Amino acid sequence: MKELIRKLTEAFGPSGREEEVRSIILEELEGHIDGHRIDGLGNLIVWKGSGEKKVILDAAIDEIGVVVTNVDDKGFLTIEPVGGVSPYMLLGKRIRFENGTIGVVGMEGETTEERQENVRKLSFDKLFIDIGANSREEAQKMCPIGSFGVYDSGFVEVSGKYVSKAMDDRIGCAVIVEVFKRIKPAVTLYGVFSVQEEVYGVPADEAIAIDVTDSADTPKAMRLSGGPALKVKDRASISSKRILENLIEIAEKFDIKYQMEVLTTREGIPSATVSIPTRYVASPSEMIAPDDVEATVDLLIRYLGA
Amino acid sequence: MKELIRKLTEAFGPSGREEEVRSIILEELEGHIDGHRIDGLGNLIVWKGSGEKKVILDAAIDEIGVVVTNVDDKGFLTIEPVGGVSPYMLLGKRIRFENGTIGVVGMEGETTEERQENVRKLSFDKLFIDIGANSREEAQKMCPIGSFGVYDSGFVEVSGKYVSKAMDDRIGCAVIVEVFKRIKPAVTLYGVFSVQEEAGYGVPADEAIAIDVTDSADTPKAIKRHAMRLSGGPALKVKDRASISSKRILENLIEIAEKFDIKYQMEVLTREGIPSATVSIPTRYVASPSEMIAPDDVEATVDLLIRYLG
Numbered sequence A: 001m002k003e004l005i006r007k008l009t010e011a012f013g014p015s016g017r018e019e020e021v022r023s024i025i026l027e028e029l030e031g032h033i034d035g036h037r038i039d040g041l042g043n044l045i046v047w048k049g050s051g052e053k054k055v056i057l058d059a060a061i062d063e064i065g066v067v068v069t070n071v072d073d074k075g076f077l078t079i080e081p082v083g084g085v086s087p088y089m090l091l092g093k094r095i096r097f098e099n100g101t102i103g104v105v106g107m108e109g110e111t112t113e114e115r116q117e118n119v120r121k122l123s124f125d126k127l128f129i130d131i132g133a134n135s136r137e138e139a140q141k142m143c144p145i146g147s148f149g150v151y152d153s154g155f156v157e158v159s160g161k162y163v164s165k166a167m168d169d170r171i172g173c174a175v176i177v178e179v180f181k182r183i184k185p186a187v188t189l190y191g192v193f194s195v196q197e198e199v200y201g202v203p204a205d206e207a208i209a210i211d212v213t214d215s216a217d218t219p220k221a222m223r224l225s226g227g228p229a230l231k232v233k234d235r236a237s238i239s240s241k242r243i244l245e246n247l248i249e250i251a252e253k254f255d256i257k258y259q260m261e262v263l264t265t266r267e268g269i270p271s272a273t274v275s276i277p278t279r280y281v282a283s284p285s286e287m288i289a290p291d292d293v294e295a296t297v298d299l300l301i302r303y304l305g306a
Numbered sequence B: 001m002k003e004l005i006r007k008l009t010e011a012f013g014p015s016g017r018e019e020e021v022r023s024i025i026l027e028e029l030e031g032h033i034d035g036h037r038i039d040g041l042g043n044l045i046v047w048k049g050s051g052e053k054k055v056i057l058d059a060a061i062d063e064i065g066v067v068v069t070n071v072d073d074k075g076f077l078t079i080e081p082v083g084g085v086s087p088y089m090l091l092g093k094r095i096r097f098e099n100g101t102i103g104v105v106g107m108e109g110e111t112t113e114e115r116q117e118n119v120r121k122l123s124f125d126k127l128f129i130d131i132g133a134n135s136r137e138e139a140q141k142m143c144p145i146g147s148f149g150v151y152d153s154g155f156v157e158v159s160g161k162y163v164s165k166a167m168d169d170r171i172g173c174a175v176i177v178e179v180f181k182r183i184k185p186a187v188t189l190y191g192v193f194s195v196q197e198e199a200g201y202g203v204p205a206d207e208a209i210a211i212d213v214t215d216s217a218d219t220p221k222a223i224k225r226h227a228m229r230l231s232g233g234p235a236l237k238v239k240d241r242a243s244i245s246s247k248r249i250l251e252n253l254i255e256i257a258e259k260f261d262i263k264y265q266m267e268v269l270t271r272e273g274i275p276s277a278t279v280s281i282p283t284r285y286v287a288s289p290s291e292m293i294a295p296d297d298v299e300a301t302v303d304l305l306i307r308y309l310g
Helices: A001-007 A017-027 A136-142 A168-180 A240-254 A291-306 B002-010 B019-030 B114-118 B136-142 B167-181 B244-259 B295-309
Strands: A035-039 A044-049 A053-062 A066-072 A077-082 A094-096 A103-109 A127-128 A148-151 A157-160 A161-166 A188-194 A206-214 A230-231 A259-261 A271-278 A286-288 B036-038 B044-047 B054-060 B065-071 B077-082 B094-096 B102-107 B127-130 B150-151 B156-158 B162-165 B188-194 B207-215 B235-238 B265-268 B277-284 B291-293
Touching: A001 A017, A001 A161, A001 A168, A001 A291, A001 B044, A017 A044, A017 A168, A017 A188, A017 B244, A035 A148, A035 A161, A053 A168, A066 A136, A161 A168, A161 A240, A161 A291, A168 A286, A168 A291, A206 A240, A230 A240, A230 B265, A230 B291, A240 A271, A240 A291, A271 A286, A271 A291, B002 B162, B019 B044, B019 B054, B019 B162, B019 B188, B044 B077, B054 B167, B114 B235, B162 B167, B167 B188, B167 B207, B167 B277, B167 B291, B167 B295, B207 B235, B207 B244, B235 B244, B244 B277, B277 B291
Parallel strands: A053 A188, A053 A206, A206 A271, A230 A259, B054 B188, B054 B207, B207 B277, B235 B265
Antiparallel strands: A035 A044, A044 A188, A066 A077, A066 A148, A077 A127, A094 A103, A094 A148, A103 A127, A157 A161, A161 A286, A230 A271, B036 B044, B044 B188, B065 B077, B065 B150, B077 B127, B094 B102, B094 B150, B102 B127, B156 B162, B162 B291, B235 B277
């Protein structure tokens, strides 16, 4: 499942250019599905099994990044955030583009006091990125305007933890993939991979969102290795609540460690939301515990079949 | 070429289920190819010749269809479209599936009132498909949920013109295949048949050409300046941001077309990693069970490519 964690977390998938991610999900799932289709707006719909119950397992394809807005005289890039990324996780951080070009990030500091003052009020109009080109003529071909970029950091295992970029949400995509690769369906199971936008082709009876939640384990609560984070919604149908209680009895039934969050898009069909605790969200080094993710897989395997 | 266009347009190939169209294409080009391959996504790629210049041609193997999203109790199938299918081109039509199955679409509402209204502001929420199924189980065994079907209408000739379902882009497939069958390749030819998805095909190529369908506005009550028309020749499209290389390929195709009296017709519109040009065959009633092309546009097209590449 860890080959999978790399192949997905390392897959280049910013908004609108996620084709590789969909690929690895497909060739990864090839041999364990009945069908799929890419919907008008870019979401991918997988279905497996013959069942009266139709369940949707949603997971966000996309990962945070930056977009170019201005190419410079000497060939430097102006950028702006896509997804919830802070200009602080980018200082000294190197960036990939879809063609493969690597760029480096720096600050528009002039003096020695400006480099200590641009930060306490740092926006993206004070950053820049080097590609290696010295001209705008040599820089526009390397990267047009509207080019996206992502973290260059890859997947590393730190003493049993899985640290990589974009554990949000391809720990969830990876979990769904693994479920399809190990489950024998007792239901008609769709797995939908979503394009979030402006910050359902199939009709089902129950939707289940696989997302991540920030871990409060940071010094000074959702904890690693404590289980999947089950989200209770302050306002939901009797049917969403029954989804929740069903997953609860099944978790208490098979001695499955699990957590429960309450934090202050829903299909109209009854939906629930389960998250994996992930530290350092919106950083190149988001940390998950694999026992949590195989615990989540095990739970879904149990509730949705054998 | 009537036999080829027949096989291609009548082949069943909806969003991934193209083993029939691929098998027909390889079946067709056998004895003329120097190799082929199916990538991890299903794209069929062939190559012939070993010239210095590398030229690629590409045309989509896919056709519009329907996907079944639900099966009710009586055996009727609720559908959502695959591709750009008008709900109207379906009403009264029969639907063709892979395992030997045929269905018939129907509209909800029994009274004259709700039918007459539902046809106004129609959609697939208000449709279904009967298989002759009386049980939901035998429907699930005949047509599982997630099953794709294409138009059941087939190929026929009308006073010299060719009509069939899925001319886009099986007619481009026919152009490529005939080109490969009647070629003495001077360049290194790669043929690419597009699956599913609208930045390379794993083939480095000097230049690339697309064989596409274009809407012919020669129909009545259509009055556009510089309209596409049947038997006007292959339509050579002009792009807005066309690079020097794309304009070079395009200009070369114009040169051949006029040098050998090959009829052709430009097409004016309302990044670019490879030199590319876009040629199109004019076609009538795209997205209908009965798309129509003129054969001499296809012959002039294959002549254009064969003389530009051999």
